[PDB]
């Protein structure tokens, strides 16, 4: 019920947001920087902007050009996707400033969630459990930091407040070494963040990655939306994503999902969000919420019926959620293989030509990507040219329909991950389930 | 639970059905003319077979190097797809003689609901509603059939009980016609069917084509699948169909569903199957059944999380059909465009090279075809290229979404009814929902 939506993204995301803004009648704006002119979104969009030239920094993280976009086709909405500018609050501040909608979060709750101390603190006050930690930024008393590491036991890991993707992130095995990982990692985050806040939790050393999504409308109403288990990964990127996430009953999931809702309503949460655990010995540990649609958000839609980016737009025009809580059953099982154009063993982007396309169809299988036969896969982004969702009425059937579709997809000119896929689908730990988040790696070794 | 299934047909069904062989781990024999070499579920199979050449007659049509393939393979089932053999009863006969299972009823069972009068009969016996008519055939005694006639009311029609696709049917407006009607349509038949025996029903001047989806098991059991509205249709051709049926309350769904279900149970049927009503009036007419799965089987797919064609292979291995009645709900609405490779205008085949094929995707569109770039479509069989399936909450959605896949579909180098399915899917009446059968020609002249 928002009259005009920027498309403030590219690729797959971009295109999934046109499907939803002509599902509602609503005009999009495609903003694309000179090489993503035959972007598939870009081709079918009511209005076209080139917002800069090639590289990131000088287009898609324009936040002046993208605001002029909106201010020259008289939009009411935009739509920052995921990456890029999604989670930059400072973004988000200068788009209501600016008299226009941010599809996501007010500026204040994505600053909020976005710094992981602030982000815990809430929780916690919520009712969310935790990681055990130092609660609250480390000192440089050594003394208060070994008592605060002995209460919590070795092995403990130092985050940076401002880090992530791995980056301000220290693991300790022992006290004699505890006084120089917080210095150096305080050092690393000013250095890195201009933030020198860290904090200690509990080292986890074999967690699955489950995530629970939530939506939450400005009528109040805040709902969860089962969870997905995003473990099968390789040095920080998600390979295949599922949901359920297996050994998850519907007694944890209300649980677990119900204090996710809560803490909505209590931080004032607007939009489509996901709350990010560690899961280990059957406990649930809230690590950080991402505060934007993801990538891997298909496989909810798979098993709960929800179009969670139709739910964005109605929430961002002031709507109510189209349903409650009561109204969502989970029903079978979903998986997503992200379609890289990568090399399948050393992971080196394989830009060019496809020179063939042959996407997959049938019963129980979605396709989601820009790509088409005779598109160029540009140098100057992500990887990510499809991503392959299977449903099934049981976990087995969601996986040998992925197998079943993989074989009859064709990427004719470059190399994908295809291959990779694969070897995970068939790999008999993965379908007995619930591999933690290392294991991709050690398989690969 | 069959070891290995010979897909006696071509096209988009014999992929459809590779594929749900795949899933079950049963291993394919695809049986090809010399023309098919290059058909995708050809180039998928575990064992190829070529049956003859390129005309249907002498490949499609062969029974002896049908179950010969059988042979040679030791295979256990054949799967008829639809068109072709999948209602020849001496070709069913043939094929359970040779020791293999046909995937569908009992030869005895093909033969009576193949036979127009005999249907009637044992539908009118199991309590199904029928077009009020002769109730059996007609005499050459015109002053019994103006009796009938007269009882009936004018318009009345003529059939041919071995008739079919229109060719064996006559309207009668007033009863000085009625007496040549019968003896010529009678001629007709005999030098056509070789079967001279016909039927009069009242002719319905505007009903809706509303079709049931039935399975029965070796168990006894028989299950409804709600219904389809196949009404928008062009001499004799189906061109979009639509699940559930717009007007059908549950409450008459459950009514003349059971009724469908009981006559399985009553005729022994065994399989997929199809009842064919006229709907006129808030009433449902029984016309005739068709025993194999059809074309059109998505859209039930979608509104009811049934594989038909799983329960197919299920039931033929012997198994009981995986659900019961009371696990079937209708939820939302399902949409399918034929899209066929013909001039949009005039209906000629435009056969030739698919230069470029730019499939559509997203949440709730499903594509079920054979054809992909540098595919040739030949001559010697009928037009179909794809099946566009879409999926929403609510029908508006389902038509907004078609609306929007066709749009993204680009088929390059042959002439597509695409342009077709446009002009039905923004007529007002077609939106409103509920035109009769005869609303597609009056659009078009
Ligand atoms: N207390 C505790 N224990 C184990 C952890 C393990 C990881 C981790 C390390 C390496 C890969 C990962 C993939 C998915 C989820 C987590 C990880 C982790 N990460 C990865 C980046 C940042 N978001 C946090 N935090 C952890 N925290
Ligand atoms: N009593 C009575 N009243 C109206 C009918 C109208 C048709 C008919 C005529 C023309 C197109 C049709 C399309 C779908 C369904 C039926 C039709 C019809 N057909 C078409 C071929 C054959 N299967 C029967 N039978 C009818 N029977
Ligand atoms: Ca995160
Ligand atoms: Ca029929």
New interface residues.
């Given amino acids: 019920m928002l009259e005009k939506v920027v498309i403030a993204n590219r690729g797959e995301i971009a295109?999934?947001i046109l499907?939803a803004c002509?599902?509602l009648g609503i005009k999009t704006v495609a903003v694309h920087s000179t090489a993503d002119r035959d972007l598939?979104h870009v081709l079918?969009a009511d209005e076209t902007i080139c917002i800069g030239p090639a590289p990131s920094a000088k287009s898609y993280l324009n936040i002046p050009a993208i605001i002029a976009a909106a201010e020259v086709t008289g939009a009411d909405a935009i739509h920052p996707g995921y990456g890029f500018l999604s989670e930059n609050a400072d973004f988000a501040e200068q788009v209501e400033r600016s008299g226009f909608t941010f599809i996501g979060p007010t500026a204040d709750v994505i600053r909020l969630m976005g710094d992981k101390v602030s982000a815990i603190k809430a929780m916690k006050k919520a009712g969310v459990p935790c990681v055990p930690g130092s609660d609250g930024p480390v000192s440089n008393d050594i003394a208060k930091n070994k008592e605060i590491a002995k209460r919590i036991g070795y092995p403990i890991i130092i985050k940076a407040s401002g880090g992530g993707g791995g980056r301000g992130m220290r693991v300790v095995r022992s006290e004699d070494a505890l006084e120089e990982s917080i210095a150096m990692t305080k050092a690393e985050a000013k250095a890195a963040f201009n933030n020198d806040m860290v904090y200690m939790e509990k080292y986890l050393e074999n967690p699955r990655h489950v995530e629970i999504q939530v939506l939450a409308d400005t009528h109040g109403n805040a709902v969860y939306l089962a969870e997905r288990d995003c473990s099968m990964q390789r040095r920080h990127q998600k390979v295949v994503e599922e949901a359920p996430a297996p050994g998850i009953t519907e007694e944890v999931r209300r649980d677990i999902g119900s204090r996710c809702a809560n803490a909505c309503v209590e931080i004032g949460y607007r939009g489509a969000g996901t709350f990010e655990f560690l899961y280990e010995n059957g406990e649930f540990y809230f690590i950080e919420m991402n505060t934007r649609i993801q990538v891997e958000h298909?496989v909810t839609?798979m098993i709960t019926?929800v179009?969670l980016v139709k739910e964005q737009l109605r929430i961002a025009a002031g709507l109510p959620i189209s349903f409650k809580q009561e109204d969502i059953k989970v029903?079978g099982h979903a998986m997503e293989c992200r379609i890289n154009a990568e090399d399948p063993k050393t992971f080196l982007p394989s830009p060019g030509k496809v020179n063939?396309?042959?996407?997959p169809?049938?019963?129980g299988?979605?396709?989601?990507?820009h790509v088409?036969?005779?598109y160029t896969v540009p140098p100057h982004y992500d990887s990510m040219i499809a991503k392959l969702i299977t449903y099934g009425?049981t976990r087995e059937?969601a996986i040998?329909?992925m197998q079943?579709a993989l074989?009859?997809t064709?990427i004719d000119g470059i190399k994908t991950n295809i291959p990779l896929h694969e070897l995970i689908l068939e790999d008999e730990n993965f379908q007995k389930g619930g591999t933690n988040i290392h294991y991709l790696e050690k398989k690969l070794g």
Same sequence: chains 1, 2.
Avoid: C, M, Q
């Fill in positions: 295109l999934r499907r002509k599902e598939k079918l298909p839609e019926g179009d029903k063939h396309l042959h996407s169809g049938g019963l299988v979605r396709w989601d990507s088409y036969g005779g009425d059937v040998r329909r079943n074989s009859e064709i």
